[PDB]
């Protein structure tokens, strides 16, 4: 994969928007919306969230795990804990992308829930390589993943898995 | 180039008590092939203070003390010469006492420490180099 | 030994791991198969010289040159193999026409292998729905927006709307246009997505 | 099989191919039936094409399943070019009642283009070669998949007594057991029937 | 800019303090000396100026100023903030963009630099403008080397009813101006200037026309003109009319290409015959 | 990103067939001592005799190799002797396996095929030499960015390269996702040619 | 504040900037994964984009302030212990 797709399936989490035009239910074929009542909130996927806000016609809110202090919780647990401990959402680090970057004024205190969600991350990508190093300087054979969401993975999985690849050939190279 | 052994590898064909009690350990050697014992009794046929020891050696026998040697090598040679005259005056205390106290050379394959004078920086303090 | 030839077809693929089609060799290629044929007969002849006389102690001079020409067989299977990736690519980054300076470059067989290739392609691209099936040759990357923004870099001469509603391409004149047409030539070099 | 949940496993069977090492089951089901969704929802558009706003909600949706659907097939038809005659061969022979691995249309597109690289590979190098060596066997060329291959999975369907061969020595292989939403890293050679039967998924 | 580099240059405290003059540029001196800001540094950039010395900088600047008669100092503008280290006036966004456009080396069709200045007016091409902004210097010091030249030699004639000047390939820096449209701001200065130096009664009131060369291969040239300056001028200009009546009376070549009338192309030759006939023609 | 050359198997059981990798792999030289005459060919090195130390690509043993070592007989590099393989456990992050090479891991894994004594011995040096130099790949690589690293890659093999090469294109791919940059439509091999 | 801080105190305050990298580069990179686990000294360097002044423009007021100056090499000891 690459960031470009996670990015993708990350666009279908739910969020909760307030209109500001008049529309009756829609029928998608992945479920139902509406109907848009002005100045009433209501829950669609994030690609229609900010499409929409793109075009002037909504006003985005925050998740209610995205709050300056439930995080500053989870900061602290996370580097409390020598395990991957579970997140707020699994496809958090793209809601605190597009979110703040595309309704930054709709959001209170966006720079202090952005530079906490980073905290979290630059540990949870820590634990990752010493849980990958041990792997290779034991010689394992199976290896526990926790609570990993699916960006960590993708951002050093095409380069563990083909190195050790090339060790399983090297480990097996004898037997015949 | 790089020399990484004094025995050029290409045609080479043609607290302070388990230092002393590891060390004494590796120079019994007698078990696997005696290659030691053929030496400490060479030199006391030839009247030598010093032996030469091989690190590569110690490696294979036990790693946590040939790293324990590289890094802190005053600890560790203070130790080992130690654990030398012990085992010297274990085949003639007559010799062991001609003496004031023994040496001990080192040569091997150290790994990152064979350096010339112009890489020799300050994070090799008291540590063996070549 | 042997096999100084054909490691010189190999020896120059190996310096463009870029995807890049260079020009075919037919010159070396050639002189490979003459060697082929050179050690074949000669190699041959004392084999059924083997038979005639009894010179058995020559079976190793049949290994030498047995194997031998396995080797020059492989070294051009690989090259005239390799380079047949190296143009399936050009249908799939490219289009379905190519410009001259790369039909230059393939040996005249090879353009056969492609408008085969290229055509049981679209043969299986109109078999998958009802309408003229789905072409899978676009969408290379998700889909952000609706519209999209390009920005004209040469000249081309009238590119067409569906609805027979054209439009003049000049260059540095940029247009809003469905994103669902302007793929197939930001790809290639004409356009560019400028409001990113 | 409400049309809100071909999506759901249809993104499902996109991960997967993107993932194995080999070609994967084929499920012309899916492949028929969504392209039955876009059939139909680009005609009550181009019919009531009069409304502004609810027509592009609706293409939106359609652009991106089109997409998903779309980079599924090309996943694919790059493991039929990489792998012809061991794709080939494996459906020559398949013990009847086993799902194929090659829909009907694929198949006409592995036999065309075998045929193919052969009719060119004969009038290039293999007709001016000494009348012993003009065949080659593509069984012994083109490589088979290699299913030795290490992958990240997450289990949906709680399995017990799953067999971990580090090595060769048949002795150290210690068994283990799966949690219900776990993610493990292991050889794609040891849950290669889980794939197949939905226990797991390649993440 | 630095705060020296900038008073230097613009061309409304470049005129007053006679900044061309070495008997008036001891003016400036006393100017800073009678604000205490030290000459080490009112020399480097103002991002790094002391931090004690900024307090009421806008302040103690518009009063030492009404010493000198510079009474309007402060004028009423926008400023925007994006992030940490982002901060425009609305007169430096204009200067930058205003110099992308019109960059003296030409790069292909007259179209091309028109795209690079619409491109850095969207806040994801700060890279632009902050690029545009060293032309936009480039620019300010190299018209205030210009307007020295026409003043500490006398090149403004007084050709009757209106002012006259023209330019010197040879003199450095006379290429920029090239342009039909980075030719009138230029004037417009001059005229500033003038305006505040000569000692006449008259000339302090009369329009000026400007001509400088075009063309060396069609040998042609381009000319200008700009209403009578004062302090408030009704910006009512009339030379559309005077060139077109004069170009029609003498019968020459001219070419009208832009979209204001008061710029034209002549040819080297007709400009006299033009000149003559547009002095009858003013009167 | 379409172009998907053929991949080495130079580690398994058997190089592949068409891969460029492995047929530049096997070109190298290895040397061999014969063990009969060699008739109608002493040309190259007319007879040769038996009991002559030569230099024979390694494909070309391939074949003239039998168990009872009809033919001739092999011996290896010392690259792969006794001498080297404890430099190679001293520290392995300090060798320039790309003078030694530049297939190491590759040529190490065709030498297997040969059935010397000491093999129990040289597919444990690769093994722990290939785990030795990990932590040095795997942070030299994900944490080098917008710098020159053409001196992060000067000792480097071939299978060492190829994973270098794919920390950074999942580096450089995240920092361009990051920076709101994996948005615009590009041109793909186009950019190649220009 | 603390960038004139810097320009006028700059031995007592390089300091403090040395001991905050420390607490920062701990708080980013932990766990370290086996070999090491003790944290190392961050050496600040700092550069900047002002004009520069010159060898006789260091009048004795500069005296601990940051200066500036461009120049030529013309001389190397050799490294030594400190």
Known sequence: MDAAEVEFLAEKELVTIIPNFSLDKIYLIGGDLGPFNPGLPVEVPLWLAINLKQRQKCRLLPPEWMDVEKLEKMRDHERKEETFTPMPSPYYMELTKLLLNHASDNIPKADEIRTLVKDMWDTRIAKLRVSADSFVRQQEAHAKLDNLTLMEINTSGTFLTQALNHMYKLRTNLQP | MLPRSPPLPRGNLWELREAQRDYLDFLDDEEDQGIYQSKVRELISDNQYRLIVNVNDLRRKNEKRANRLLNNAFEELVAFQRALKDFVASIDATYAKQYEEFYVGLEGSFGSKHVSPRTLTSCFLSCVVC | MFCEKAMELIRELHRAPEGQLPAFNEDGLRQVLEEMKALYEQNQSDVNEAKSGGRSDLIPTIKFRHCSLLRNRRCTVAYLYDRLLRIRALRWEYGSVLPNALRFHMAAEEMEWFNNYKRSLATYMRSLGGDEGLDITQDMKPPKSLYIEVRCLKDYGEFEVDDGTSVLLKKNSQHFLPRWKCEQLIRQGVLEHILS | LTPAELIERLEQAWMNEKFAPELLESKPEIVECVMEQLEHMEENLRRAKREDLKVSIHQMEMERIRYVLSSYLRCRLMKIEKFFPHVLEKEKTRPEGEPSSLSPEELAFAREFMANTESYLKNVALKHMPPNLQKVDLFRAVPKPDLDSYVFLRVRERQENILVEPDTDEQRDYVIDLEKGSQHLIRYKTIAPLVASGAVQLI | WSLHDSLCNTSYTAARFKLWSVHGQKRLQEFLADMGLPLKQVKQKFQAMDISLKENLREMIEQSANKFGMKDMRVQTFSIHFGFKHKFLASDVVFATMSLMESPEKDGSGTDHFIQALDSLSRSNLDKLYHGLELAKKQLRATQQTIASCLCTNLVISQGPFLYCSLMEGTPDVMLFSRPASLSLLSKHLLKSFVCSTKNRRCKLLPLVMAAPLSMEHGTVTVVGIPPETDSSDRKNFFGRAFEKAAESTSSRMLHNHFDLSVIELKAEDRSKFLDALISLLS | ?194 | DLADYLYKQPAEHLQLLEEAAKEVADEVTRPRPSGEEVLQDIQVMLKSDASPSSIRSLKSDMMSHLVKIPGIIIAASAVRAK
């Open chain 6, 1 to 194: 990103e379409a172009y998907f050359r053929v991949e080495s198997g130079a580690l398994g059981p058997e190089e592949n067939f068409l891969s460029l990798d492995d047929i530049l792999m096997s070109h190298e030289k290895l040397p061999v001592r014969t063990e009969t005459a060699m008739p109608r060919l002493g040309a190259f090195f007319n007879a040769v005799p038996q009991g002559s130390k030569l230099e024979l690509p390694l494909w070309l043993a391939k074949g003239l190799f039998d168990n009872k070592r009809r033919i001739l007989s092999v011996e290896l590099p010392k690259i792969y002797q006794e001498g080297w393989r404890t430099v190679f456990s001293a520290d392995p992050n300090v060798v320039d396996l790309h003078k030694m090479g530049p297939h190491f891991y590759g040529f190490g894994s065709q030498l297997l095929h040969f059935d010397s004594p000491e093999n129990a011995d040289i597919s444990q040096s690769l093994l722990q030499t290939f785990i030795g130099r990990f932590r040095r790949i795997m942070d030299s690589s994900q944490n080098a960015y917008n710098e020159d690293t053409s001196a992060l890659v000067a000792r480097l093999d071939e299978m060492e390269r190829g994973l270098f090469q794919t920390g950074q294109k999942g580096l450089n791919d995240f920092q361009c996702w990051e920076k709101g940059q994996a948005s615009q439509i590009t041109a793909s091999n186009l950019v190649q040619n220009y």
